[PDB]
């Protein structure tokens, strides 16, 4: 996005990122950069140990035996990708990680969760992974030679608006990674076809003045509430409380049976 929203949302680096294309007759440093970019983006910005590198796959990329898309497929199908994204993750978290790593976006619909779940159940992890890489979306966005990059913060054709908001649920910052078993943040949002407020970068913080407590810290409690007291006017509720009253807010939320969806520092 433009700078004025970019600094607020903490997505400046994504906006200024330039797609990396492996051209013909590329030098050694260009193949090195492509391999590094693929490892960074497909493995979700983990510190990749040299013992986890795909030496044969990157040799085939180096000798121009395979394309960038093929190397991306090899990294995605590799046991390293399985270990850190599949074997200890729920299926819905796993496929949103696949959407982030392979297509550079957040899931748009619950039907996309129904797809890749049935696809896994029929054809295994390999068929499920190949669905993303062989998709029309991957072809039109990246082709055979462009390293996949995150696209959820930019307006795409055939995109739902919610994706942009949901993008902030799968991209938590430039210095973040998809390393830690974890549950998807988008489960209820996808199932009920909703959107959640974006609290990313500096958007989550709120004014304090003298209303914050001793340590000048406010907390935002996003809860789902119903009538169990006073009249409830909305199903969604947001409470801004100081640290000193946080426990009290939690307990009164708890004794009314309201479910806490998110708690963040504001």
């Amino acid at each position: 996005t433009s700078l004025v929203s970019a600094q607020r949302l903490g997505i400046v680096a994504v906006d200024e990122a330039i797609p990396l294309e492996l051209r013909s007759r590329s030098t050694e440093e260009e193949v090195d950069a492509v391999i590094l970019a693929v490892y960074r983006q497909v493995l979700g910005n983990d510190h990749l140990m040299s013992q986890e590198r795909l030496t044969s796959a990157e040799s085939l990329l180096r000798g121009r035996e395979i394309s960038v898309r093929d190397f991306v497929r090899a990294v995605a199908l590799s046991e390293v990708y399985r270990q850190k994204f599949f074997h200890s993750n729920p299926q819905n978290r796993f496929i949103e990680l696949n959407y982030k790593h392979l297509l550079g976006r957040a899931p748009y619909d619950q039907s996309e969760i129904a797809f890749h779940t049935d696809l896994y159940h029929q054809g295994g992890y390999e068929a499920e992974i190949n669905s993303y890489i062989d998709s029309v979306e991957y072809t039109e966005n990246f082709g055979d030679w462009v390293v996949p990059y995150f696209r959820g913060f930019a307006t795409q054709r055939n995109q739902k608006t919610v994706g942009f908001s949901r993008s902030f649920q799968v991209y938590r910052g430039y210095a973040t990674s998809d390393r830690s078993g974890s549950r998807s943040r988008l489960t209820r949002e996808l199932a009920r076809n909703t959107a959640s407020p974006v609290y990313a970068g500096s958007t989550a913080e709120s004014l304090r003045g003298t209303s914050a407590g001793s340590r000048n810290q406010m907390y935002r409690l996003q809860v789902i509430q119903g009538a169990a007291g006073t009249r409830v006017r909305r199903g969604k509720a947001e409470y801004l409380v100081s640290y000193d009253n946080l426990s009290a807010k939690l307990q009164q939320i708890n004794r009314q049976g309201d479910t806490v969806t998110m708690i963040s520092l504001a």
Partner: protein
């Protein structure tokens, strides 16, 4: 509810005053109404000069940065509130004022005094204010978005002792909680300590005997222990509270307020005698049977 005696007490203006709620996506008049209601009720109807107004808390409430409950908390923890109600008051009076402002009711028993005085002494005034505001009672009555209001009417977890003590704490609509006859003295220390009640005396303009207050000592007890025996033959006994006794003058008149237990058969004579002594009848309560 209170219907026939609402105007005599100060309850009638609060009968048609609905609770002030800040709805989601509120307008600016809604924000100003919440600010006005909070100033009137939390600060006990004191006049608020412009220099004492909490501009930042008002701004934050207007913006939605804080809720009504948070704004009430900020007002109750402010230096304005502590100057008006904390620094010059016995902590039992502070507790009475806290219950009246933040909960809209009088303290029920000595246990509340115990809890709040211990909490003030061990963790400070701010923590005590928090206990008033984070209480289950506050949540069920006002919640997050409703300005606290006087709870005159009977409710689920009430005691009638609170109904009687409300009129010890509240002295009329044009009254300001720092402009009452008892001034800075605790109104309920004896009552909460002894688990007793006082006959309800209404506010000034609606009740001629409004100014009656019992003294420190030498007060006529509520009930007629002994029955009608000291009064010869009598049917029923009544405790009459009399204020503004002045006509005979000192030394014939020592205390301008006097409570007398009189038989039914002397009630006519008692009333005439009260008229002669220039007094005003505050209340008359059955004392026997």
């Amino acid at each position: 509810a209170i219907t026939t005696a609402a105007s005599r007490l100060g309850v009638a203006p609060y009968n048609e005053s609905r609770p002030v709620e800040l709805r989601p996506d509120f307008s600016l008049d809604d924000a100003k109404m919440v600010i006005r209601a909070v100033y009137r009720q939390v600060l006990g109807n004191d006049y608020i000069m412009d220099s004492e107004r909490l501009k930042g808390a008002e701004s934050l409430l207007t913006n939605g940065s804080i809720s009504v409950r948070e704004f009430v908390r900020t007002v109750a923890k402010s230096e304005l509130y502590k100057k008006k109600f904390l620094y010059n008051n016995f902590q039992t009076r502070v507790i009475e004022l806290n219950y009246k402002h933040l909960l809209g009711r009088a303290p029920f028993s000595e246990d509340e005094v115990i809890f709040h005085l211990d909490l003030y002494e061990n963790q400070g005034f701010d923590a005590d204010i928090d206990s008033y505001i984070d209480s289950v009672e506050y949540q069920e009555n006002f919640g997050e978005n409703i300005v606290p209001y006087y709870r005159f009417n009977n409710q689920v977890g009430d005691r009638t002792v609170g109904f009687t003590r409300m009129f010890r704490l509240y002295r009329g609509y044009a009254n300001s909680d720092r402009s009452q006859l008892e001034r800075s003295s605790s109104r309920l220390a004896t009552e909460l300590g002894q688990n007793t009640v006082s006959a309800i005396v209404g506010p000034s303009g609606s009740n001629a005997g409004w100014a009656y207050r019992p003294s420190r000592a030498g007060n006529t007890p509520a009930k007629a222990l002994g029955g009608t025996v000291p009064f010869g033959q009598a049917s029923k006994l009544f405790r009459v509270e009399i204020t503004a006794i002045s006509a005979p003058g000192y030394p014939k008149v020592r205390r301008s307020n006097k409570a007398v237990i009189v038989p039914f058969e002397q009630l006519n004579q008692t009333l005439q005698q009260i008229n002669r002594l220039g007094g005003k009848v505050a209340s008359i309560t059955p004392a026997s049977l």
